[PDB]
Amino acid sequence: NVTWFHAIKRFDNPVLPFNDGVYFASTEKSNIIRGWIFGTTLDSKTQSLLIVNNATNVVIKVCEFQFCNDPFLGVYYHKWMESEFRVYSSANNCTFEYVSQPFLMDLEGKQGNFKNLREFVFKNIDGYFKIYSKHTPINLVRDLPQGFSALEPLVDLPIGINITRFQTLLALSSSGWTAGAAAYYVGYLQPRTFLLKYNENGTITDAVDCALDPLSETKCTLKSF
Amino acid sequence: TVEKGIYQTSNFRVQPTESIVRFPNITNLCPFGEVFNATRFASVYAWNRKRISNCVADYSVLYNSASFSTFKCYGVSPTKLNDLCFTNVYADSFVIRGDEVRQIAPGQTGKIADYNYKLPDDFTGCVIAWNSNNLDSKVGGNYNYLYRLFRKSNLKPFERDISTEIYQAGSTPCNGVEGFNCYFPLQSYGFQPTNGVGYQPYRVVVLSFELLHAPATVCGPKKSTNLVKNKCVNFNFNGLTGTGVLTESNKKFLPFQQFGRDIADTTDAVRDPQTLEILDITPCSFGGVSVITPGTNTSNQVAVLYQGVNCTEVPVLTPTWRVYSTGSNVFQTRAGCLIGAEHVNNSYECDIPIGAGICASYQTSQSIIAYTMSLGAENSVAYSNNSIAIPTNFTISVTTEILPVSMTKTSVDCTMYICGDSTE
Amino acid sequence: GAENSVAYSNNSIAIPTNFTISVTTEILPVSMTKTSVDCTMYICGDSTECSNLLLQYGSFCTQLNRALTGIAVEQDKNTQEVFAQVKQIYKTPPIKDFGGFNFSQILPDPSKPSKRSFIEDLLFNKVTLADAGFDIAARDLICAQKFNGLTVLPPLLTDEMIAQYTSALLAGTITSGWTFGAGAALQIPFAMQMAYRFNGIGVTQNVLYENQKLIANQFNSAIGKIQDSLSSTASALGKLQDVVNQNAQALNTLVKQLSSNFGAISSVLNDILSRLDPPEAEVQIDRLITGRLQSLQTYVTQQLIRAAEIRASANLAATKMSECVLGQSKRVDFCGKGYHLMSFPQSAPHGVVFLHVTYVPAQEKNFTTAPAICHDGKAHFPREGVFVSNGTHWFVTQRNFYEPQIITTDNTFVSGNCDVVIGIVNNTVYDPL
Amino acid sequence: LGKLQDVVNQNAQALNTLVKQLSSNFGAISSVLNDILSRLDPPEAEVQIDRLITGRLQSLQTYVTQQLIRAAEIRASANLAATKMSECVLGQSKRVDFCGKGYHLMSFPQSAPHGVVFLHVTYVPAQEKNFTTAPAICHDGKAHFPREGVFVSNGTHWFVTQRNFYEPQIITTDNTFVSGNCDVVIGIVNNTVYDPL
Amino acid sequence: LGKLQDVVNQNAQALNTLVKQLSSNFGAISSVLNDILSRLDPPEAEVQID
Ligand SMILES: *[C@@H]1O[C@H](CO)[C@@H](O[C@@H]2O[C@H](CO)[C@@H](O[C@@H]3O[C@H](CO)[C@@H](O)[C@H](O)[C@@H]3O)[C@H](O)[C@H]2NC(C)=O)[C@H](O)[C@H]1NC(C)=O
Ligand SMILES: *[C@@H]1O[C@H](CO)[C@@H](O[C@@H]2O[C@H](CO)[C@@H](O[C@H]3O[C@H](CO)[C@@H](O)[C@H](O)[C@@H]3O)[C@H](O)[C@H]2NC(C)=O)[C@H](O)[C@H]1NC(C)=O
Ligand SMILES: *[C@@H]1O[C@H](CO[C@@H]2O[C@@H](C)[C@@H](O)[C@@H](O)[C@@H]2O)[C@@H](O[C@@H]2O[C@H](CO)[C@@H](O)[C@H](O)[C@H]2NC(C)=O)[C@H](O)[C@H]1NC(C)=O
Ligand SMILES: *[C@@H]1O[C@H](CO)[C@@H](O[C@@H]2O[C@H](CO)[C@@H](O)[C@H](O)[C@H]2NC(C)=O)[C@H](O)[C@H]1NC(C)=O
Ligand SMILES: *[C@@H]1O[C@H](CO)[C@@H](O[C@@H]2O[C@H](CO)[C@@H](O)[C@H](O)[C@H]2NC(C)=O)[C@H](O)[C@H]1NC(C)=O
Ligand SMILES: *[C@@H]1O[C@H](CO)[C@@H](O[C@@H]2O[C@H](CO)[C@@H](O)[C@H](O)[C@H]2NC(C)=O)[C@H](O)[C@H]1NC(C)=O
Ligand SMILES: *[C@@H]1O[C@H](CO)[C@@H](O[C@@H]2O[C@H](CO)[C@@H](O)[C@H](O)[C@H]2NC(C)=O)[C@H](O)[C@H]1NC(C)=O
Ligand SMILES: *[C@@H]1O[C@H](CO)[C@@H](O)[C@H](O)[C@H]1NC(C)=O
Ligand SMILES: *[C@@H]1O[C@H](CO)[C@@H](O)[C@H](O)[C@H]1NC(C)=O
Ligand SMILES: *[C@@H]1O[C@H](CO)[C@@H](O)[C@H](O)[C@H]1NC(C)=O
Ligand SMILES: *[C@@H]1O[C@H](CO)[C@@H](O)[C@H](O)[C@H]1NC(C)=O
């Protein structure tokens, strides 16, 4: 089961618990939900992680920053226009800030054969926050497609704080408002044993979930595919 | 006296020619002065955890300073820290009552260990503690140091609690002002110079680094040496030490991949920290040493089989004798390097097995010869579709066959053998 | 199985009017890989502190090394016992005139670099290694286990030598019958040897001589069927494979056991030595020593038991070589199903295949039978055979191949009178004089 | 007598190693239990005594296991010896090489320390000679096959001989039996079969 | 049928011994895991359980 959130007035952007990591493959353009928040307070009380991953770079910023009830830029672009500014309410204090390479996702305006499956694995554990990522050129815009692809690590940060909740940051009055055609996926990670097939080059070509079904458990016990 | 045959003996192996060290190219010293001259150490419930990474740490000076009342390293020895390399270091500093200095150690329990500050069972690191009464104690009571005494549930290890919510052990939840069954969680210490030992404040700092689980960042001031490959040497890459031969490889290491492990959890490849290049690791050659000898009374000369190694290596050790390396009769059999025996084209019935069809025999002048054993004498039976051989005579043969039937009947007394006339 | 009621009766017999020559394959493990494990290297390689600590445990792994060395020597002994049954390397004549039998598929093939037969090459192809080359290696073993003090010793007899022994045995069998097993090889035409064999299972040799073409064709077709089966199916040699596999996994397990903490801070000994001082390092090193010594003892005990099993198999194989290949066996089902005629050996990786040739009666007919015949108040019993009747006339036939003959005084012998034998039947016994 | 000596030596070596194992510390302060008891009090002596107990118990386990394996192989050998006594001494064996090399005539047992010795008496043909041979003889359009033996010629005349010891005899209707005509046997040779009547 | 009975008996005996071996302390405070767990904290329960 993977929860599907409709990104928009109808802000389907609640504070979701961060139980043992999250999987964040999504299909949309302009990056809509560029930023993410991870903390236990998320109201400047604690140094809540605010990752950006904007079109420029992932500006990691773990600071005791205030997140308003609706911290969104409110840009009704292509309906590019702006309504207010609450993405960055105020930074009461801070703990650390890192800036990565000025990369750029494929958020740019393009639908075609939708190749913007930017599948991400945000895992927080043992005082660390890891951003394993991959980009897959899929052909279907409907719900997550069928296929296999191993996710490479992208950043590894020794933050050391405790987090018990997360949230997603939306940059996007109520009369005749066109609901944004954007959505994302939240999948949860739990402790499991996986049998991974390292091919000749060192890349995982396939995996077996040892608790999915009796056949997979047999494969795991025998150590064979 | 040794009978004719081949006998196993202590193995052989190539010893390392030299040693290698490869550490990150960093010179900045870690901010140990900052954490050891922090003007005001935080409270026990507010114990402050500073990070230390991307630096060079010289623990020798810290260990040599006598100002530290307690200096205890658990998973590591303080002398060895100068040659180890770590991923990151957490320097956690605070002030506590002297008596609690025992609750600090791993596996302990108490109000300190169950409300404010808790260590892990498997802690690996070093705890340092020194009295700071003169620094942070006043006659009137330096109540700036508090600790959490009330909490609904025990805190997890390395957990910090700052909320001032009024706990209520006896139900009746209040808030703000205290009252029935409910009181202020934080209690201030009576740190005064007049206080006796134990009650006086103590400044404590604990280093709880992790080990060998990520690209190492902070470690000791020992200079890296040059990299030499294609040779049996001792390597020390970011503290990972071992012995073997280095060589380039076509591996694909991820940007955050450093080591290549083996099925036996041994490193068969590494990444040089100074140059982001992948370097293969292989244990330099070893093997067993067999000695081929006829009857010691038949003669005293011998041959030697270094099994499992191509002989080219042997000129390029453990057996304590290198005299025979002169060679001129080294023979590279599929079973190893045979030294001291003459190879010959003639084939005879096997006398002393060597392996892979090679046998050694002591024959005429006298010398030990290695040869391909002969299975027997060739013979073409005179077969034709109208010829028969019929025996015109016979022999009555009497042969012997020996079969073991029984072995010695032995019995053991448990208590006598294990515990000779001992009641304990 | 299928229900079957035998048409049993107190005066009914079934006699085969035909036969088939069936060739069946029997695979027997003979040897196993000679693996040697070095105590000090395995428990702790190139570590002097640990070596000194292990020195306190006495002579445990001198015993372990001795046990492994004994197993390794026993493997060579097994191969020698099974295959070195012949003291002369017999070879067949260039002309393969064997009465229509032709053994090209089991005789050595000169063209190939290894003088193995076609079927021997099939057998060597079917069995495939599991981990890495033990062999066709032109360099170091190149295996994972090699990293940790484990070595593999080559067998004393090369595969080519085993093939030479097999070819010598086969040439002796097909050019001299069983004589070479009891002394000097005495040549005999192969058809005459087959006549001997037929006479050994109770059928007269005229049966062979009058069916020589058919018998040769049946034998050739059986050999062709064997080669086709070996080429097609995959699990034919499982037995041999199993042995290999078992050893492999055992070794793997042993190697993997070096990754266990055994309660120490780390499974890596170098990490313990680097991180910890000698006094405290001794505790962790002792935990590791205990664990690894236990693992190695478990390995050696398993290996001893497996070696005993393989030695039992090799003794059985040597007995089969002596009794089915070097002679004709009357023991039922010892050399295949049917009446044993001869067996041919083929060498397989770490084992031996036996091609057992057997005579199997094929087309039975029902006849009325009597234990004796009454002629003139005398009871006649067959000298060698049985009395049958198609329904109106009585004949004497050999009991393994219907060949009716007139009942004469030469066919039978007289004993007593008619009054004592139960089931006797009157009939005339013809006197040739 | 290498086999009996080998079993004796193996047993002696196992016992010697078991006794030697009593000199090992196994990590204790000393290998002498009395010294540990006299040098330390119970609470600290217990750890050293436990080390020694573990080591000695492991030694006993190893000795008993190898003893069981040796007993298994010795039982296999004794079963083989009993079968040899039953089949080679109490009778005549047609099993090839089971009671010596050659055709087995008889066997005699002798007792040896911890084992048995069989003196196998066998018959081995000695001096072979060549002969032209035929599967059958054609006499009057009838094929004659030897009742027991083989037809052999020395160049001009054909005889029938027992096929294990050269003893030529005239081919007669008592030496042979008839089966069919001469058109089907391959290698049949024309010669005269002598009728004694 | 003693030869058969022996086999049966031996197996039973072995199994019995195995089961009986669960009543040995082996130097621990007690032979019951639950007692050790319910009486001691992880640091010492680990030694006894080992
Ligand atoms: C053994 O048997 C006889 C020995 O005499 C030989 O075979 C037969 O030899 C006779 C000649 O003596 C053949 O008869 C001839 O036939 C031709 C053609 O019909 C005819 O023109 C001649 O006048 C003469 O009658 C006979 O065909 C031949 N075969 C048979 C079956 O009788 C020979 O030495 C040996 N043959 C065999 C089958 O063992
Ligand atoms: C079958 O082989 C027999 C050998 O076991 C053989 O008996 C041997 O016969 C020779 C020849 O008579 C004897 O040799 C004697 O005579 C020669 C010639 O004068 C001397 O050079 C010898 O020294 C000896 O005096 C052997 O002594 C005798 N062996 C035995 C054990 O008695 C038979 O003769 C052979 N049978 C046939 C038919 O050839
Ligand atoms: C031979 O057996 C038949 C019985 O019939 C079959 O016998 C076997 C050959 C086999 O085919 C079985 O499955 C059958 O039971 C005896 O009697 C014959 O029976 C059949 C009918 O069952 C009948 O038609 C025949 O006439 C019977 N007689 C024959 C075949 O001769 C028969 O008696 C047995 N032969 C002799 C010589 O006794
Ligand atoms: C011996 O038997 C083999 C196989 O039964 C025969 O070999 C075949 O020979 C033909 C040509 O004669 C080839 O085309 C086939 O490819 C061969 N196949 C095999 C499996 O050998 C051989 O001819 C026989 N020899 C005699 C003399 O009959
Ligand atoms: C049983 O066998 C006899 C002899 O083989 C058979 O009798 C012969 O039958 C054939 C034709 O069927 C005749 O040409 C012969 O002359 C007969 N010989 C005698 C001596 O009579 C008899 O027919 C057989 N019985 C059955 C039921 O087949
Ligand atoms: C074989 O068995 C049959 C029965 O199946 C016996 O048949 C008997 O035959 C005699 C005359 O031949 C009759 O008087 C009996 O009544 C028959 N018995 C039955 C039960 O029908 C036959 O006698 C037996 N023959 C032998 C030799 O035992
Ligand atoms: C087999 O032959 C004998 C003798 O020819 C038969 O016995 C005769 O039987 C008849 C009729 O019962 C008697 O009258 C004779 O006195 C008997 N003579 C003798 C010498 O016993 C016998 O019956 C025959 N068997 C069968 C089955 O018919
Ligand atoms: C080691 O030196 C190289 C070049 O001299 C440099 O690129 C590298 O950054 C240095 N190591 C570290 C950890 O910076
Ligand atoms: C504190 O500072 C003094 C001088 O500024 C220095 O000598 C001392 O080593 C420092 N304490 C540390 C490094 O623990
Ligand atoms: C070995 O030779 C010596 C001669 O120096 C001799 O005394 C001894 O008996 C011989 N031993 C054997 C086993 O041949
Ligand atoms: C074997 O003979 C060849 C010549 O055919 C010779 O070169 C070689 O040296 C001989 N073998 C040895 C060991 O000398």
Side-chain angles (χ1 to χ4, degrees), chain D residues 1 3 14 37 47 51 69 77 87 89 93 113 118-120 131 133 138 150 167-168 170 174-175 186 196:
Chain D
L1 284 75
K3 297 168 84 177
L37 287 165
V47 181
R51 304 227 68 176
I69 295 164
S77 183
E87 297 187 17
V89 180
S93 285
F118 291 106
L119 308 177
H120 300 297
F131 295 104
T133 189
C138 190
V150 295
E167 176 172 301
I170 311 297
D174 302 322
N175 276 324
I186 296 162

Side-chain angles (χ1 to χ4, degrees), chain C residues 165-180:
Chain C
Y165 272 139
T166 295
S167 76
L169 291 166
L170 192 143
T173 304
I174 70 177
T175 60
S176 165
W178 60 77
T179 58
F180 77 108

